[PDB]
Structures are given as structure tokens and as C-alpha cells.
Structure 1
Amino acid sequence: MKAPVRVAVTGAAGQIGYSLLFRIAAGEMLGKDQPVILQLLGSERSFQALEGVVMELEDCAFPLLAGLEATDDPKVAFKDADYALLVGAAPRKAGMERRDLLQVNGKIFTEQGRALAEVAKKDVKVLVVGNPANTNALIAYKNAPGLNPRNFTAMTRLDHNRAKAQLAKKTGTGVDRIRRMTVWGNHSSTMFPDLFHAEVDGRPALELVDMEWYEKVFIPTVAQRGAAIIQARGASSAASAANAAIEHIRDWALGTPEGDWVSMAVPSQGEYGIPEGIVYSFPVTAKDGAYRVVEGLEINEFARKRMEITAQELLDEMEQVKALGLI
């Protein structure tokens, strides 16, 4: 019954893409009732492999995959897009250095932000997964004037799900009984998983775990989880990253559960005193494709201190791209 929506995905030939595309085509991201047209962007160096992923998708015989198109042109991939998941970012090359990587991503997201503004749906919902996510998102939306800045987001949902997982393990309770988890700030080592408002079966998390565990075990473990997966598998956390991206878009479009909220890095509008413009993760609720930061939460010194640390790191990153004239 529902008309198909177009889902653009970049870095479609990479690991995250490989774990992402099939679940999207299966209807797990926008609903089992929502047909999807996948428009995949891949570099010329990976277009061959991309065609390979296209065949595998066809080989799943997905009833909801109403369209499938791979391209090397951003203006084609983003044409009339309703959703855009920017997974592709600067590659990891031995020579590729910090500031150099910043120049590559500056070009990628400047070009993609412009393409989105030119050819995608004006209300296109964008999610940046490619790292550095928050800053890449900033470059993108700043270079997409004409488009609602709040339609540009970065992913901290994996950090958020990782936090929920650790809490459920410690309390010995089902992860489905964990609510109001929050990861503030940047998707980096400065991320701040907040347990002051989290609940386990309706009971405050800090009534089940002590501050010592929270500060010395919980936070660092959530922060190092990504490294943990790489050391164990010798490969990145593609499947769980794809899952978080799916949930990030899903909750944004379909809505968050009553009484709960999720983490989303979005352009700050001064909420909780956080500097404006930077893409900062906030606790958010969503309804009908629009989200709203959860305001009014009590913030103690412990939380404030870490919220500013991560905020400052984002300002530093923003300063650098600004100094390079990228925004």
C-alpha cells in the first residue's frame, strides 16, 4: 500500500555496508510495510565489489526491495533521497595522516552535503556513521544550507547500545528492561555514558550499581568496547554498528517508546548549556520523523564535568575544520 522511499547509503561496499543493506532491504529499518529503493554510493575503486553486493541483495529475493541502483556519483545516489546514511569516509592509509584525513573528509562531506542540498528530498533524514562522525556531520550540514540542520545527525547509538548491554550484564537483568540510557557528546574516547537517569525495571540504575563501578569500570569499558571487538575479531564491529545505524534511523522515523528515550548526536541549540552548532549526542525522544532533546534533567557535577570535556573536544575539532576553511 505504501509508496516506496529512497534510501541512499554511501561506503556501501565496506564492512558496515555489508551488514547494513540486507537488514534494511528486509524492512528492519523503516517497517515491514515500507518498500525501499536502495541507492548505493561506492568509490570507483570499490564499484566492482559493490556490484557484487548488489547481486547478493537480489539473491535474497526481498519483497520490499522496490529498487536497487549502484553509482559513483553522489548526485545520483542522493537523488530524491528520503534517507541518507553516510557510512563512507576517508580511508585508513599508512601515508594518510591526521590533518590529511581531515582534508579528505572535508572534501567528502562538503561534496555530499552539497549534493544532498541539491538533489535529495528537502526533508531528507541524514545519519553520519563514517568517522569522525560528529565533525563529519558538521561539515556536511554546514555545506548544505537550504536544508534543515537538524536533519543531519551523527551516530552514538552503538555507544548507547553498548552502555545498555553492560548495565544489563552487571545487574543480571534483561537488556529489554533497561530504559533512559544516555551517552552525551562525541563518539570518541570522551563520550559520556550517563547512568544518573537510567532505569532497570523502573528502578534507578545507581541503586543497583555503586559509583565506584560506574566510574572505574562501566565508563572505560563502554569507551574501549570498540577496541575490544577489534582485538577479538581482528575486524571492526560492523554488524553491531549496522544495527545501531538501523535503530538510529528507525527510532527517528517510527518513534521512541513512551517513557523512554535514545541517544542521538545532533546540532546543538544550546540545550544544557552545550555550545551551539557542534553535533553533540543528547538524550532524545522522537515522533513522526522529528526528534526533540529531553530537557530538564538534573545534572550533577560528575555529569557536568564530563559533558563539558566532550563538548570541548568537539569545539576543538570544529575549530580545526573552521581553520581549514571547510565551514
Structure 2
Amino acid sequence: MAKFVIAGKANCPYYAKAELLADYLQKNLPDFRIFKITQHPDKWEDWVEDVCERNMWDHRTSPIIWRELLDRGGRGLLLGGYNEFLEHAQLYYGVTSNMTTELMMVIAKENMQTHTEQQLDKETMKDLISPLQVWIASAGTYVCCHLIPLLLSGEVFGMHTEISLTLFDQEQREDCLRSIVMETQDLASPVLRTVSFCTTVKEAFLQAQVIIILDDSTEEEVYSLESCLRSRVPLCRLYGYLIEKNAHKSVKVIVGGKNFVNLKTTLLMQYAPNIASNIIAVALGVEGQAKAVLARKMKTTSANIKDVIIWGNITGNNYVDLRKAKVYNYESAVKGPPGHYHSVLSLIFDREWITKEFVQTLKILSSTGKQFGGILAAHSIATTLKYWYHGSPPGEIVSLGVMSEGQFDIPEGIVFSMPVKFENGTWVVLTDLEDISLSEKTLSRLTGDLIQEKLVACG
């Protein structure tokens, strides 16, 4: 096994004739191997000068010819332009090229056309492209690792999506996000085609089609709540402006995290009014926690529990409504066939536990956020996106954080958590649900908290 390379200019006569000789040799000789290179003549000078410098050869005319000692792209041993290779082949093999000069002219045209083909092929590859564009803000965060595998599952969209993903934080976070990108590549998902980092202002959200917004790890010290709220405002303003300018007009923006989620969403919408309708806050995790608490009390599975509703600040003061909550597969001897359901309030004989204890427990869970881990956050975000594209389960209520336009009573211009279904790529608010009215005291408490947060943030 001998190994050779020749580089060409698309017009070079002698390079073409070399190609003829090479193909003759490789066809007839068992021993012979060659790789083929050519550059546009303008590039050729630079490309060859670089090669020659690396080798410390001294050759300039096209073609250039060298034997590579072990493998393709090793070190080379230099043979001279065409006459020297022809000499080598004639003496060592005994072979002769027989091609005419006129033929060399024609093939010089043919190879010009071949390079034109190569160029068009490059352009052709650009045509083939129809990815989905995704972005993630505050990506340098532990939740992000759990989220990415759910995205890669493709179930979010169906296993038929060219996915392009983007991740943002500052350069120090960019180091760990580099590691995240490495793991992402290793995850070797069938729908993954690209992933990217961003750190820099102009780039962000550029033609973004999906945007994920996480909590920030505020590296700043423990400022007062008022300072924390205000500190969000510059970041929300920047993100809103960047999204509105850079993103695709139909971009979807999802806000998730443990803190001030409603406020962040509201500010973003304020700065990004047009997209604001597209922007939603994930409540599902709180609902899941409530379901699990109920299931533990009942000694059943959470999946049997359905139609829990979260009424409030997701990451703050919220009310959990069980009036519509249903349980399935329970062992009431008043026992239906599969798919029968009984009302949680009816089953739980301890109203005191519901009123005092359950509420206090949820208040603790929300305030601490302790049990809100990476798995739950990821599950909530992923499942919300899944319902947004696919739709929610028929008949089942979902909770979502969304901007009030007065719907029940709720004052306009705040983001509230409320019961919703997902259909046709879009959500609807279940304003036709009976009895789910709130008390005036409850509503006043819930809205007042959000309003005060908003006011303090605006300062």
C-alpha cells in the first residue's frame, strides 16, 4: 500500500493529466492509493504556500505531489510537479501517459466545470436546511442539564424535527455551558443537528423560534427583596428588547423557575408587548406537588388525581382549588368500572386537614422551594411545551401562568395562574367552568401580592 496526494488548479493542464495517470495506476496497480485535491486558482497560491511552509518544501507550480508516509494527512515526502511524477511512474512502473494536449485543454474545461459543480454543491447544501430554532436564557444552571434530554426526546415536537439549540450566560458560565454542549453532542439524539452558546448582546435570540427562560443564579450577595426585584428589571428589559428585535415573530417564550416567575413574565411582556401573548409561565410543578401531597394523604398515586387548580402567584401566594379535583381507581366499595372517578373533597373526611394542614404544607413547599428540584422543574417545562404543541389531554384542566385581561374578575395587567386547556397549538382559559369562582378576600389577597411585587420592582 503506497499513498500519494496531488493538488490541482481546476484549469491546470498537467494536473488533469496527472489525474489521468493516477487513475490509470490505481486501477491497474494493486499497490497504489492516491487522494485527490484541487483549489480554485486564486485560493491555490495561499493554500499551497501554507502547505509548503508546514512541510518546509519549496514548490509553487500546480500541480504539487507528495507521498504520505502512513495515513491520509500524515507527514509527506515531496515529489515534484507533473514532469517529476510522470518520470517516477515511467521509471518505477514503466507506465506512460498517452493523453493529447488538446485533450488536456478539454479536461481543463471539464475540471473548471467540476469546481463550479463543487461550488454549487456547497450552495446546494445551504438549500436543504429547515431546522427548529431554540434558545435558553440563564442556561448555565443545574435545571438545564435535566431539561436538555427531554428536549432531545423529541416527544416535545414529534420525532420529526431538525433541532437547533442555543444556550446563554456570561463567559464564566460559558465554560460550563461548553461542557454542557459537549454532553449534548454525546447525547447523539436523532433529532439533534446543532447546539450553540451565546454570550453577547447583538446575537441573542436571532431568528429564535423557541425561547426558554430559567431562573438566574444571582451571583450578587443576598440583597433585600426590594433590591432583588429591582435587579430583575434591567435583565428583563434587556431580554425583552433583544427578543422583540432579534427573534422570529412567532417565537414561543416560556418562563420557568422558583422565583418571581410571574413578575419576570409580566416585565418581559411589558417590554415585549407584541410577543407578550406568546409568553406563558409554568405553573404545573406546583400542581404536581399538590397532587403528590393529596396522594400521600389518600395513599394513592398522584396520576389518579386530576383537575387540581392553582390560583395565584405560582412562585408565591397561591390558592389550590380541589373543588374540581377528581380521583381515579380509588377503592371506594361504591366502586365504578375503569374510568369512574370520585371527588377528592368528598373522600377526604378530614376537612380540618384540608383547610389548615394541607394549605400550610403547600405554603411551606412554595416558600422554601426545597422539594422543587431539577427533575420536577424539567418535567413541568417539558410537559407544558408538549401540551402547547400537541394539546393538553382532552377534558383535563391544566394550570398555566398567563396575563390577565379581566377574564374572571382579575385586574388586567398582571400574570396570574389559572386553569387552561391546550389545543390547536394554543391555550384557552376555561372561563366556562362552573363554581370555580374565588372569594373576594382570596382574590384581593392574591392580586394584591402580585401588584405590590410589580410596584416594588418598578420602584
Instruction: Return 5+ residue gaps in structure 2 as ranges.
Output: 1-128, 329-340
Answer yes or no: is 1:272 the counterpart of 2:413.
no
Aligned to 2:447: 311
The AA in structure 2 aligned to 1:205 is V
Answer yes or no: is 1:135 the counterpart of 2:267.
no
The AA in structure 2 aligned to 1:290 is T
Aligned to 1:179: 306
- Taking the aligned partners of 2:207 and 2:167, their CA distance within structure 1 comes to 13
Candidates 195, 206, 209, aligned match of 1:79:
206
User: Are the equivalent residues in 2 in contact too, given 1:261–1:284 (CA < 8 A)?
Assistant: yes
- Taking the aligned partners of 1:302 and 1:279, their CA distance within structure 2 comes to 17
After TM superposition, the runs of 4+ consecutive aligned structure 1 residues lying more than 4 A away are 226-229, 299-304
User: Are the equivalent residues in 2 in contact too, given 1:70–1:77 (CA < 8 A)?
Assistant: no
1:25, distance to aligned residue in structure 2 (A): 1.9
Percent identity at matched positions?
27
Answer yes or no: is 1:149 the counterpart of 2:276.
yes
The AA in structure 1 aligned to 2:146 is S
Q: Give the alignment of 1:254-269 within 5 angstroms.
A: 254-269=390-405
- Taking the aligned partners of 1:175 and 1:34, their CA distance within structure 2 comes to 32
| Structure 1 range deviating more: 25-34 or 148-157 | 25-34
Offset from partner CA, 1:224-244 (integer Å, 9 cap, x none): 2356673x8xxx612211211
Aligned to 1:12: 139
The AA in structure 1 aligned to 2:425 is G
Aligned to 2:364: 224
- Taking the aligned partners of 2:220 and 2:214, their CA distance within structure 1 comes to 17
1:287, distance to aligned residue in structure 2 (A): 1.0
In structure 2, do the counterparts of structure 1 residues 151 and 229 end up closer, same or farther at CA, with 3 Å as the change threshold?
A: closer
Offset from partner CA, 1:115-141 (integer Å, 9 cap, x none): 111111212111112421000001101
Offset from partner CA, 1:118-173 (integer Å, 9 cap, x none): 1112121111124210000011010013x242211122211011112222222233
| Structure 1 range deviating more: 108-117 or 313-322 | 313-322
The AA in structure 1 aligned to 2:348 is V
- Taking the aligned partners of 1:301 and 1:79, their CA distance within structure 2 comes to 42
In structure 2, do the counterparts of structure 1 residues 77 and 294 end up closer, same or farther at CA, with 3 Å as the change threshold?
A: same
| Structure 1 range deviating more: 129-138 or 32-41 | 32-41
| Structure 1 range deviating more: 278-287 or 183-192 | 183-192
Aligned to 2:224: 97
User: Are the equivalent residues in 1 in contact too, given 2:316–2:366 (CA < 8 A)?
Assistant: no
| Structure 1 range deviating more: 281-290 or 174-183 | 174-183
Aligned to 2:108: none
| Structure 1 range deviating more: 81-90 or 249-258 | 81-90
- Taking the aligned partners of 2:245 and 2:235, their CA distance within structure 1 comes to 15
Candidates 179, 203, 213, aligned match of 2:342:
203
Higher relative contact order (CA 8 A, sep 6+): 1
Candidates 340, 344, 352, aligned match of 1:212:
352
Candidates 151, 157, 169, aligned match of 2:296:
169
When the two chains are superposed, the root-mean-square deviation of aligned CA atoms in Å is 2.4
| Structure 1 range deviating more: 189-198 or 123-132 | 123-132
Aligned to 1:52: 179
Corresponding residue SS for 1:285: strand
In structure 2, do the counterparts of structure 1 residues 255 and 237 end up closer, same or farther at CA, with 3 Å as the change threshold?
A: same
- Taking the aligned partners of 2:202 and 2:314, their CA distance within structure 1 comes to 28
Answer yes or no: is 1:251 the counterpart of 2:387.
yes
**TM-score when normalising by structure 1:** 0.89
Offset from partner CA, 1:62-85 (integer Å, 9 cap, x none): 111122010113553412222211
1:93, distance to aligned residue in structure 2 (A): 3.3
- Taking the aligned partners of 1:316 and 1:25, their CA distance within structure 2 comes to 39
1:303, distance to aligned residue in structure 2 (A): 5.2
Instruction: Return 5+ residue gaps in structure 1 as ranges.
Output: none
User: Are the equivalent residues in 2 in contact too, given 1:41–1:74 (CA < 8 A)?
Assistant: no
The AA in structure 2 aligned to 1:209 is I
In structure 2, do the counterparts of structure 1 residues 177 and 71 end up closer, same or farther at CA, with 3 Å as the change threshold?
A: same
In structure 2, do the counterparts of structure 1 residues 301 and 283 end up closer, same or farther at CA, with 3 Å as the change threshold?
A: closer
| Structure 1 range deviating more: 121-130 or 50-59 | 121-130
| Structure 1 range deviating more: 252-261 or 3-12 | 3-12
In structure 2, do the counterparts of structure 1 residues 309 and 25 end up closer, same or farther at CA, with 3 Å as the change threshold?
A: same
- Taking the aligned partners of 1:160 and 1:17, their CA distance within structure 2 comes to 21
- Taking the aligned partners of 1:305 and 1:299, their CA distance within structure 2 comes to 16
User: Are the equivalent residues in 1 in contact too, given 2:260–2:316 (CA < 8 A)?
Assistant: no
In structure 2, do the counterparts of structure 1 residues 302 and 88 end up closer, same or farther at CA, with 3 Å as the change threshold?
A: closer
- Taking the aligned partners of 1:218 and 1:182, their CA distance within structure 2 comes to 14
The AA in structure 1 aligned to 2:354 is Y
